[PDB]
Write a protein that binds this DNA or RNA. Structure first.
Ligand SMILES: [Mg+2]
Ligand SMILES: [Mg+2]
Ligand SMILES: [Mg+2]
Ligand SMILES: [Mg+2]
Ligand SMILES: [Mg+2]
Ligand SMILES: [Mg+2]
Ligand SMILES: [Mg+2]
Ligand SMILES: [Mg+2]
Lengths: 58, 117, 110
RNA sequence: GGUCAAGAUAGUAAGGGUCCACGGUGGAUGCCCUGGCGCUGGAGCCGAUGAAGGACGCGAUUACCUGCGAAAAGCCCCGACGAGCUGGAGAUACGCUUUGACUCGGGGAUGUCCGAAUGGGGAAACCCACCUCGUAAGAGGUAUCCGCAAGGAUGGGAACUCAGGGAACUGAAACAUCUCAGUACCUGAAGGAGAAGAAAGAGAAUUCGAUUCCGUUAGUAGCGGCGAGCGAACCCGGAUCAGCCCAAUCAAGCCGAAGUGGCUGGAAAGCUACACCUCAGAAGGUGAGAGUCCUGUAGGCGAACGAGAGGUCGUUGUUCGUGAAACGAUGACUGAAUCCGCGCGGACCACCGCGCAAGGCUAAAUACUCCCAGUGACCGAUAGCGCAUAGUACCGUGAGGGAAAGGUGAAAAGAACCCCGGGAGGGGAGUGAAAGAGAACCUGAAACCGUGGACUUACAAGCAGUCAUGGCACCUUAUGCGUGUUAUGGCGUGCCUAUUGAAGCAUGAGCCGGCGACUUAGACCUGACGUGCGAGCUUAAGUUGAAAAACGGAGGCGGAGCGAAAGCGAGUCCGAAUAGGGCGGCAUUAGUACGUCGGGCUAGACUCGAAACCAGGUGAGCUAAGCAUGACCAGGUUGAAA
RNA sequence: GUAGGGGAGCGUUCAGUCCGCGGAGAAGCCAUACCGGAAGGAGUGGUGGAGCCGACUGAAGUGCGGAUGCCGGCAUGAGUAACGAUAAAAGAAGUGAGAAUCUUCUUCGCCGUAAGGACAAGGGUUCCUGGGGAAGGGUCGUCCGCCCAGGGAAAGUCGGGACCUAAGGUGAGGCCGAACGGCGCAGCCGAUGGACAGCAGGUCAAGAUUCCUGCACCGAUCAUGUGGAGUGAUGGAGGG
RNA sequence: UGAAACAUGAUUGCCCGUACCGCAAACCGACACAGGUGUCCGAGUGUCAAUGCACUAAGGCGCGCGAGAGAACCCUCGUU
RNA sequence: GCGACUGUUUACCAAAAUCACAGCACUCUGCCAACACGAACAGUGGACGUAUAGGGUGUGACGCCUGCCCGGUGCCGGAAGGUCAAGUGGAGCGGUGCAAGCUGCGAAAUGAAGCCCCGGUGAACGGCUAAGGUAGCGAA
RNA sequence: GAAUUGGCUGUAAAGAUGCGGCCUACCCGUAGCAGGACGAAAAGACCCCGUGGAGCUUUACUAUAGUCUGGCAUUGGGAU
C-alpha cells in the first residue's frame, strides 16, 4: 500500500510550531546613486541601467 | 407529517460547546470531543466537593501545629488538650487564630499544657 | 414563475385612457396610457419617470449619459376616472355603435 | 554615592495557547414557490384515410426548447374576444392589427423521411426499380393474410382482464411431501373494462332459482410428513338487477354590489374616525395583512354549432396432498340411452329428492389508473418524483444505470461618469427603503483559514480537565458578585461496543452540518386504564345526507355445563350405583362496545450487511475456437531424393 | 446500580380552538454573569427582513457521537512527493501589460526500415484565416489539438452503389413446434475476393487521377455515310 | 426495302466518400498515458550479405516545468 | 533425472517432468452407422464419407519387450430352472334391494426386459482370500 | 479518537508515551535511519463455529433426460 502513513491529524498548533521558519527575508534594497530609485546591491539599477556609468539600455 | 430536527440540534450542541472554554484545542471547538470531555468532567466536578472538604481540613491541620510546635507542643498533643478542656472547642478557625493572632494562639497553647500534665 | 395571471391578462383599461395612480408613490398623479402590457400587468403612463443611463458601448460614437424615460407599473393605478377621483366601472349599454359597449361609474362617460 | 561580593527577581516571544473583535470560506437554519405525493371523483383506447415514438427541416438573426412541416413558430372557414400582437428569451431591425389582429373554442386543408411500414434492398430516417396519369415539374399504385364484393387484419398502449407456459430464495429452526405459488417472470388475445352468465345448479326447506362485487357465516366444515401450515360453501344482510336467441347538462365566453379622510411607512389593503355591500367575507394579485382597488366569487346570461355423455390408465381443480374420495377436467384406449328416458345429491344400493348436459349472444353493479379536476393534522429543495425538470450530464460494447442544481429588488430603476488594473477585482458617484439587496445578488449556522487586541508561554514529562489560591484585565442580567485569562498546588487511566475483566498494544471513528433505526395493518387474540350503556351490549356492507351525520341488526359477544360422540342437563362423562374428574351452588360477586396504552400473532416487521438460488434478457466489438476471403516472413547457412 | 419493569415530565413539527404579536420590524442567526430539580425557559443587545410566541387538546417521518453508516463541506499528511522516458541546448533579434517557455535568424543535439512518407480503420472539423486569452495545457504562455467567428472540402473513368458471388445471413411456396418460435430449396442480402473507361503537369491561406491546362479513353442516345444482312435469350458450352 | 457491325460528328454522364489526425498529444487505453493498431513506400556510405549495425540525405524532432548544487542513500553505467 | 522429437499451456506469481504428437492396442459402428446438437418421426453434423472409414478409450519416436491372478465389479456369450410389471383370467369373500339387477374387494395359472445362475475376457476396473511378481530396474 | 505523544523498573486483561516509583529533558526546525507507535493496507485466505453457501465425487437418499422392455392405437389382407 502507501506504507508509512501518519498516526494522527496534526494540531493546527503543531502544524504551526512547524512553519515558524518560513518567513521571507525582505530584500535589502539600496538607493541607486543616480536616478535614486532603490536597487539590489551588486546588480544594475533596473530603472536607469547604471553601475557607475550606464551599462544596460535605458 | 415530516418532522426535521432543525434548530433543535444546533442548540443542544451550542449548549455543550459553550460550556467548554479554556478547553484546549478540539476539546473546545468540536462538539463530539468537547462533549465527551465533559463526561470525565462530571467525574471530577462531583467528586471534587466531597473532596475539597478533605483538602481543606488538611491545610488547617498543617498550620494548627506549625504554631503548636512553635511553642513546644504539636497538633497531636495540642488538640487532645483543648479537648481535655471541653471548655475549649473551636478546631474550626483554630488554624486562623494560630495564623493571625499569635497573642491568642499562645493562650490556647499553654491553656492545654495546663490541662495536660 | 407564475406571472401576471393572478389577475387575468386583462387590462382594465386602454393604452390611451387617462388614469390616476392610486397607491404607491405618484398617488393621484395622472396621465395618458401609452403601453398596455396585459400579460405582465405593465402600464406606461406619462406619470412616473426615470433617468436611465443607456449602455451604449461601441454604439457609433457612445456619448451615452442618462435618458429620461417612463418606468412601467402594475394595477397600482386605477383605470379611467371622471369624478376626477378613481372610480370603479359598471353602467354600460351601447352607442350608435351598438357594435360596442361602454362603461361608467356613479356618473356615465369614459 | 561609588567598587567589590552574596543573594533574589523581572523583561524581550521565533513560534504557540485561551478568550474577544472583525472578517473569508461554506452551506446548515428560517421564510418562501414557479415542483412533487396520496385519495376522491372524472375520463378511458390510438393506427394503413398510416399511429406510438422518432430523423432532417421551417424562422431577418436560432445553437436548446416549443409549434409546425416545405402551403413549415404556420394556411381557410364559423364562433368567441375587443388592442393589442410580433413564442420560451429575456435583443435589434422589419412589421402586422376594426374591411378587428392576438388569444381561446370548433371543423377543414398542408403534413418531407423513418417507424406495423407494407414497391424491392437496408446495418431506422437511406439506396435502387417498375407500371399508370402527365407540362415537364409533379401525381398515384406497386406487402402479406381473410373474403365475389364492400370491408376486415397486421402495430402501439402505464396498470386492470382472461388465457397458454410457470420458478426459486424462503418456511417447515436441517429435508425430499408440503410451504413460498400457480405468486414472480415469459408468451398470446382484448377492451374501457374484462371475465362470468340464464341450471343436467346450490341445498336439506319436498327451499332458493342467471353472473359478478361488498358484509357475514368462519378461521367454523375440512385439508395437512394430520407437521409447518392451508382453508371453503349454504343461509342472511347489501350493490345491482334482463334475459333472449338456435339445431331436430359538460367546454370558449359575457354580465356581475359595496369607501373616504387623516396617521405611520420607502410603499399601506395596517392604525384611527365615520360609511357602504352582502342569494357573491371562496380565493389570488396590488411596493406589509385586501368583503367595498384589480381578478374573481354568489347569482344571471351564454353561440354558429361541439360533445354526452359413462368407463379403464395417466393426472388434475374445489378445503380434496389418495385417502373409503365424489363430481368436475382431459392425453390415451374405448364407447351408452332417450320416458313405464338421462345426470347428480361425495365410494356403493334402494328408496326420497333437485335438474334436463354435448349450440349460442347478453346490459348492469367489479378492476386499474397514462390523462384531467378537486382536496389533504402530505413534502416544501440531503424533503417531495430520478428530475423546481433531466432520464439530460455522466458511466456501460450492451441490456442497463443515472446525477446535482432554487431565491437581486416592490419595480431594473441592473450601476452613466471618475480612480488603480491588460484583465479580473475593487473604491468613489448615482439609483434604491435598503447595495448593513449588485448580478459568482434572501437568511447565512458549524468545520475549516486569517488579521488585530487582552492575558500568557522558551528546567518541561503532559486524556488534556477538575477543585483551591494568588497575578493581570474587564465590569450592559455584572463593581458587589462576578466575567475572561493565567501561575502554582492537589487530584485525575478518552467515548463507545464487546466483556469474567477495557486507558487499554481489543472494535469503531479525520472534523463539522444535515439525512439516519422498534413502525404500520388487520370487524385478529390477550391484559391495564378510561368512557357509554348494563343482564344485557354492539353493529358490518351499504343507504341517504355532508362547509354536518343519521339510517342500516344480516352478524358478533354475555346468557350451562359435561362428554370421543349419541346425547343428557345444573348436571355430566368413567362404571353394571355410589370413589373420582370437569361444572354449577359456594359468603359472594355481570358484561359488553369504543378509545389510549402493555404484550401476542400474521405481514419487509427495530435499521443496515451475505456468500447463494430462481426467472427473462444483454454480450465472441476482450478472450477460446470454427468458417469464407485476403495479406506477411531481410539476409545468410546447410544441402535430402532424384 | 448493568439487562428489565414502573412513574412524572422537557422538546420538535403538523391540526383544531383561545389570547394575541409583528415593517418604529416576525422566524432564523449570533452574545450573555438570569430562571427552573432535569429535559429545558426567559430578559436584554446585535443580525435579519417577513411571517410568528404562549395555552388547552389531537396526530406524529418527533430528539442522535458512534453503525469501516449516507450526502455535502473543510481539514492532516505539507508546501511534502511528484511535474510522465537522461534525444541536451545556446545566443541574438522581434512582439507584448507581462515571456526560460510565442515568432524570426544562426548554431548545437536526437530519429533516419524511422521519432520520415501514403493509406486503413476509428475520430470529427480537430483543416485554413483573423481574433481570443477564463478554464484545459502537470510550469509560463502574448501560444495550442483549447474558446469565438468566417472560410475550406469539386470526380463519366479513384473506392463503394445503380454489377458478381464466399462464409454467413434471409427465405414465397415446404418440414417441425405449449406460445414466442425452430429449420429450409430456388431466389435475395452479403467483401475481406471477381469485374470495370485516363494520364502528365499547374496551383487557393486551406481541395485535387475530383478544378484549370494539354492530350485520352468508356457507355449511352441521335444524325450522317458505309453496309448490305438478320439479330441472336433469365437456356447449352467455352472462359472467368 | 429500312439488320447487326465500323467510322464521323453531336448530346450525354446519376447517388455516396473525398478537409485534418491516422504506430498517434486527433484512433483503443479515465489523463495532450514509456502501452496497443492492419497495409504500402522506406535514400547514401561503409560492413560476405541484409529491412542487421554505425554515421548521415530528404524529412521530422529536442519528448509543455526551470535553474543551481555535487553530501548520505537509491537507480543506470565505466575502470579496478 | 525426466520427456523421444518441432510444438502447447496457467491473458495479470507455475512453460514444465504439463498437454499434444507420429506410432501401438482394445472396442464400438453396416450406413437414414455407431455418435452428438435439437421443443422436433424437423433439420444437421459425422460424410456429399462407407470399415485399410468413422466414433470412443488408453499408451506415446525407435528398440528388446510386456509375466502371474477372471474370486469380486464390468463387458460379451450361454441360458434349464427360481424369482418379477401392466394385462389376460374368474372362482372365493361382502354390500343394497322384494326382485331382476347394480355395485365393493380379490386368487390360480398365465404374462417382457431384467436380477439370481453357467462359461468367458486383463494394452477391462483391479489384485500380485482368485492368485500370488517372468524379465528389467532398485535407498530411484 | 483527541494529543501539552521520554527512559528505566514495576503494575495493569498477562509487551503501557498518558497508572506507580525513580531518572533524564530549554523552545522551533532541516537532512537522514527504521527499533516502537502490538505502525498502514485487506471486518485473518490458517483454525473452530454456523442444523451458511458452492464446485466435485460415489456401490449415500431421492427423482429425472436419455434408454431397453410388455400391452394399446396408427395397422391391414392370406395360410398352420
Ligand atoms: Mg435552503
Ligand atoms: Mg421532469
Ligand atoms: Mg474482533
Ligand atoms: Mg458521525
Ligand atoms: Mg535539476
Ligand atoms: Mg518436452
Ligand atoms: Mg520447444
Ligand atoms: Mg525509508
Amino acid at each position: 500500500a502507501k506504507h508509512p502513513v501518519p498516526k494522527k491529524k496534526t494540531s493546527k498548533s503543531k502544524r504551526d510550531m512547524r512553519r515558524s521558519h518560513h518567513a521571507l527575508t525582505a530584500p535589502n534594497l539600496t538607493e541607486c546613486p543616480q536616478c535614486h530609485g532603490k536597487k539590489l546591491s551588486h546588480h544594475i539599477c533596473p530603472n536607469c541601467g547604471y553601475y557607475d556609468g550606464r551599462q544596460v539600455l535605458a | 407529517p415530516r418532522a426535521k430536527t432543525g434548530i433543535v440540534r444546533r442548540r443542544r450542541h451550542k449548549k455543550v460547546l459553550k460550556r467548554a472554554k479554556g478547553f484546549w484545542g478540539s476539546r473546545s471547538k468540536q462538539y463530539r470531543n468537547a462533549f465527551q470531555t465533559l463526561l470525565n468532567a462530571a467525574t471530577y466536578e462531583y467528586r471534587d466537593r466531597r473532596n475539597k472538604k478533605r483538602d481543606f481540613r488538611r491545610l488547617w491541620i498543617q498550620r494548627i501545629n506549625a504554631g503548636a510546635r512553635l511553642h513546644g507542643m504539636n497538633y497531636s498533643t495540642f488538640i487532645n488538650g483543648l479537648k481535655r478542656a471541653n471548655i475549649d472547642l473551636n478546631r474550626k478557625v483554630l488554624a486562623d487564630i494560630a495564623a493571625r493572632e499569635p497573642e491568642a494562639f499562645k493562650a490556647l497553647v499553654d491553656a492545654s499544657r495546663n490541662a495536660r500534665q | 414563475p407564475s406571472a401576471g395571471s393572478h389577475h387575468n391578462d386583462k387590462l382594465h383599461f386602454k393604452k390611451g385612457d387617462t388614469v390616476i395612480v392610486l397607491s404607491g408613490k405618484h398617488k393621484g398623479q395622472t396621465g395618458k396610457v401609452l403601453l398596455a402590457l396585459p400579460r405582465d400587468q405593465k402600464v406606461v403612463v406619462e406619470g412616473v419617470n426615470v433617468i436611465t443611463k443607456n449602455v451604449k458601448p461601441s454604439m457609433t460614437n457612445p456619448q451615452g449619459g442618462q435618458e429620461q424615460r417612463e418606468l412601467a407599473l402594475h394595477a397600482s393605478k386605477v383605470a379611467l376616472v371622471d369624478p376626477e377621483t378613481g372610480k370603479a366601472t359598471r353602467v354600460r349599454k351601447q352607442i350608435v355603435d351598438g357594435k360596442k359597449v361602454r362603461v361608467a361609474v356613479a356618473s356615465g362617460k369614459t
